[PDB]
Paper text:
Genomic DNA in the eukaryotic nucleus is compacted and organized in protein–DNA complexes called chromatin. Within this unit, the first level of chromatin organization, revealed by micrococcal nuclease digestion, is the nucleosome core particle (NCP). The NCP is composed of an octamer containing two copies of each of the four histone proteins (H3, H4, H2A, and H2B), around which ∼146 base pairs of DNA are tightly wrapped in 1.65 turns of a left-handed superhelix. In addition to its structural role in genome organization, the nucleosome is the point of convergence for many DNA regulatory processes: recombination, repair, replication, and transcription.
We determined the 2.45 Å crystal structure of the nucleosome core particle from Drosophila melanogaster and compared it to that of Xenopus laevis bound to the identical 147 base-pair DNA fragment derived from human α-satellite DNA. Differences between the two structures primarily reflect 16 amino acid substitutions between species, 15 of which are in histones H2A and H2B. The histone octamers of the two particles superimpose with an overall root-mean-squares deviation (rmsd) of 0.58 Å for backbone Cα atoms, and 1.00 Å for all atoms including side chains. The conformation of the DNA is essentially identical in the two structures (rmsd = 0.34 Å for all atoms). The manganese and chloride ions identified in Xla-NCP147 are all preserved in our Drosophila structure. In the Drosophila structure, the corresponding Lys residue points more toward the solvent, interacting with the adjacent DNA phosphate group. In Dm-NCP147, the corresponding Lys29 residue interacts with a phosphate group on the complementary strand (position 26 of chain I). The preceding Arg28 residue adopts a similar orientation as the Xenopus Lys28 residue, but inserts more deeply into the minor groove, interacting with the Cyt-49 (chain J) and Thy-50 (chain I). The remaining seven substitutions differentiating Drosophila from Xenopus localize to the hydrophobic core of H2A and to the H2A-H2B dimer interface (highlighted in cyan). Remarkably, all the substitutions are of a mutually compensatory nature.
Author numbering:
A (entry chain A), E (entry chain E): 37 to 135
B (entry chain D), H (entry chain H): 28 to 122
C (entry chain B): 23 to 102
D (entry chain C): 13 to 120
F (entry chain F): 15 to 102
G (entry chain G): 11 to 119
The structure:
DNA sequence: ATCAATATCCACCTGCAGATACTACCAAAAGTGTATTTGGAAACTGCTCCATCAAAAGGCATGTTCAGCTGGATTCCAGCTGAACATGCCTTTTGATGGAGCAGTTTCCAAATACACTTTTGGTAGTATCTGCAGGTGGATATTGAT
DNA sequence: ATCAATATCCACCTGCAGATACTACCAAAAGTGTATTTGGAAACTGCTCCATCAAAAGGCATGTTCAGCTGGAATCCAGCTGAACATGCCTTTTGATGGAGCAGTTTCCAAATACACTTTTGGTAGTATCTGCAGGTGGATATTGAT
């Protein structure tokens, strides 16, 4: 029998690893492509300082991470350990984002 | 001699324009007066910020327009912008 | 393949991990992308409005910082 | 003579808003068009709400607009509700809303 | 055999009744004493215009009603119809009112 | 008779079970656990202290002894709870 | 008299003269009194010291000499008062506090 | 030419006082500068409000004090008020 | 309990991105001297309205009994989501060249400010008189729940 | 479905708090006129740094297989919590009175603005040396999970 870690173990390993670091977690380019695309709908042929795109990524991830923490609490309130869309939904509604 | 001005008479004029036979209780009028003041404050403060951000010492109809775009959502913004542009354009058409 | 889909399942999984999430449902990835998209549209729209007002064709860090501040999401380390 | 509101085709007081802009410490200078534009947006917004409120007052068979009508119109209008999401209207109550799961059924 | 509405029926009648009105739901004098007591512990010899106390009551009730709407979403999310302390706490935490 | 001014204590219990039930109803709540009442009183108390503390700070800054509706309205606003209907 | 800057007079490291100029040009009020910038500069320096003081220790508990964004994040979110003051703030490259819900840990929950 | 000021050098000095042998990275300095700018802006704006609410045209150390009491949490407020009062008094007993 | 398979940690090592120390230069920031203006603290007090007392009464709080049905516990299992791999697409980097356009600079005028007069107006105070609707009644219709 | 106990609806009505209506007074507001100052738009442009390439190097996303263990359905039942009821209190309401204290009005100087002039300093730039620590290697040992 080869060596397999049990479901959840590596996950917990990952929680510990990413809560310990500060690195950006989304790939730069894919992210920068998204930004420009969205911006493109409000104004055409826009240029971006490299730092502007960096602020947006820093704010976006802090935002998502923070949202995942609230969503996790909603999953646990339902006595689950798996976050679901309805958990994200409830968190945004209580925050006044969906309300 | 005590003088506390409000927007009540103007809100009343506008009300008679949209609902010629509808009145308004003084509490409701009080709510509306708070609404108009709130809007004034939010827009002026944003315009004020717009001016500082661009090292300008003058608050023009342009800062105001941008403030309105930043503060009001979708449809409301568009109409407010027309109504404002119109009023200014007509205002300047006079000596 | 297109851009919002550029934000991958594993990147989203990493963000969730940082958020202390142990188990992720399959439908989460598309919900997240939708959420990120609304967040960026809201922030960028305001940044661009600040760009246009300054008569520029370049979105600056300060435009973004100012955009974040009015959305109630103040950001430190990029100016102002 | 002829006031600036009239000159601008507005009900809202251009002169007063201009003064209020100066007295408020928003900038060293306040251009002549600033108060015209702001007065126009203020009036437009008050007109929108009063238009809606007046209709709600009509639906409830009242000829007088009260707080409740303002609250109703504001919370049912997706945009007016976002613009005033952090505002509380005294004596406005809330929107009737009962989660579906709380209703009875299945006989007994 | 006397007439008895079933458990929940009167409750639904009350939800419809209070959602239709706009009057204050907390007794006036008792609320005014609560305000005076809390203010008194901050500064002694304070007086209140009667409208200051009414403003506080309108703000307090709008605040509690709104919190009860969120609390109610947390209960329903747990598949209950009964709101509990942990529902209020969940809502206040996501709301940022807490830690 | 000015003496032994009434002493204010335990007034948070003035917010009764029936009053909390009513607010919850306006909030759309159908069923209420027995421990909700004390939790609510606690929550209301924190809310009020924060608002009254700020209102009183505005009052004191103006060198007054009387808390005005504006003081409260100004207090609510800096807490993100703008209130319409009492001035300003 | 050989000039001793307003900061030196107040016994502050922060620029009382700069802060004074910033108050005026910030459209805060028609007039700005002499004490205001002094008091303000002192409050700012103080908070800057409270945070730098904490962040410094955090850098030494990590066996580092140089304070980095992570250090500021950890000292700010672990301090009840500083965390409330900055509850609406995001610290670039700050990351988050290690924290795992007990129910997610090994063997049931 | 091209000039852009910040509180960096002053922050650095304050750092050396409390921690003589500790350095600070540029990104962290940037965060501290934003921090200090943010404190300035929050206190200044609130001081602005208190003066306006009271019909004062002057922002004096008294407005700063109240603004600090309204903006900073308990203990930080107690201390910041000390630091404040202390610096105004030291500054006064001078020339 | 035994032990293999991995992850994780500590001690040490070293190149280099990034922090640091020194010099040179200058606009502008900041302090000083003096002459003029003025915000707002004092002192006095008119007048609003806040605190407080009084008395009556019924709307609503409180305590209690009773049992319906909700929450919480338990059990069961289908199938979703984690772990581990094998591929290999595509981000990442870094090197370096156009050139868009941010940002600094010189002009110059429409529009702002300051200032003096004059005319209009929105707010109020004193008095009086309507009118929309709250609160009540009474009877008709609807909803709920027991059979 | 039928029958009954109650809640809910609505038309009709009456009192009255709030709304509305003239008369009048004037202090601050608002508009007009000239004169004087200037903010920043417009045009030109130098150089900072953003967009695009090239182009390997391989880190990391994607598809696949497998099954552990989680989510959620189905059951059972103690007892919590809702509905109803009796009792009676304390909030609400109505009207009054003293007087604390908020706010208007005038006086007056300590402190701020307005300026001219001298001195100091924080920031940009060059050129150059130093160093905390990221990232890498060993080897030890803690953790996890199968027996
Ligand atoms: Cl879901
Ligand atoms: Cl203008
Ligand atoms: Cl609970
Ligand atoms: Cl001062
Ligand atoms: Mn007490
Ligand atoms: Mn004066
Ligand atoms: Mn039973
Ligand atoms: Mn159940
Ligand atoms: Mn060009
Ligand atoms: Mn008139
Ligand atoms: Mn009625
Ligand atoms: Mn110029
Ligand atoms: Mn299976
Ligand atoms: Mn389970
Ligand atoms: Mn009793
Ligand atoms: Mn007195
Ligand atoms: Mn120097
Ligand atoms: Mn290392």
């Amino acid at each position: 029998k080869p060596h397999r870690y049990r479901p959840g173990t590596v996950a917990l390993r990952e929680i510990r690893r990413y809560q310990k670091s500060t690195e950006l977690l989304i790939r730069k380019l894919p992210f920068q492509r998204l930004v420009r695309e969205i911006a493109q709908d409000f104004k055409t042929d826009l240029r971006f300082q490299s730092s502007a795109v960096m602020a947006l990524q820093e704010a976006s991830e802090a935002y998502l991470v923070g949202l995942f923490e609230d969503t996790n609490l909603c999953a646990i309130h339902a006595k689950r350990v798996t976050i679901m869309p309805k958990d994200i939904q409830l968190a945004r509604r209580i925050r006044g984002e969906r309300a | 001699r005590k003088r506390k001005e409000s927007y009540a008479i103007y809100i009343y004029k506008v009300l008679k324009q949209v609902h010629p036979d509808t009145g308004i209780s003084s509490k409701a009028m009080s709510i509306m007066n708070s609404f108009v003041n709130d809007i004034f404050e939010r827009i002026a403060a944003e315009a004020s910020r717009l001016a500082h951000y661009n090292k300008r010492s003058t608050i023009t109809s342009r800062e105001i327009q941008t403030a309105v775009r930043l503060l009001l959502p979708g449809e409301l913004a568009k109409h407010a912008v027309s109504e404002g542009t119109k009023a200014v354009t007509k205002y300047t058409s006079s000596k | 393949r297109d851009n919002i889909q550029g934000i991958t399942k594993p990147a989203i999984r990493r963000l969730a991990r940082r958020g202390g999430v142990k188990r992720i449902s399959g439908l989460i990835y598309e919900e997240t992308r939708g959420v990120l998209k609304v967040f960026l549209e809201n922030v960028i729209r305001d940044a661009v409005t600040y760009t246009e007002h300054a008569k520029r064709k370049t979105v600056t860090a300060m435009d973004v910082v100012y955009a974040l501040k009015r959305q109630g999401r103040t950001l430190y380390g990029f100016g102002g | 003579a002829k006031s600036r509101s009239n000159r601008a085709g507005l009900q809202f007081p251009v002169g007063r808003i201009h003064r209020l802009l100066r007295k408020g410490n928003y900038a060293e200078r306040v251009g002549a068009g600033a108060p015209v534009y702001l007065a126009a947006v203020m009036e437009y917004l008050a007109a929108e709400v009063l238009e809606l409120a007046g209709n709600a007052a009509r639906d409830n068979k009242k000829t007088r607009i009260i707080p409740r009508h303002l609250q109703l119109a504001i919370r049912n209008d997706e945009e007016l509700n976002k613009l005033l999401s952090g505002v509380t209207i005294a004596q406005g109550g809330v929107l009737p809303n009962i989660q579906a799961v709380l209703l009875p059924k299945k006989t007994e």
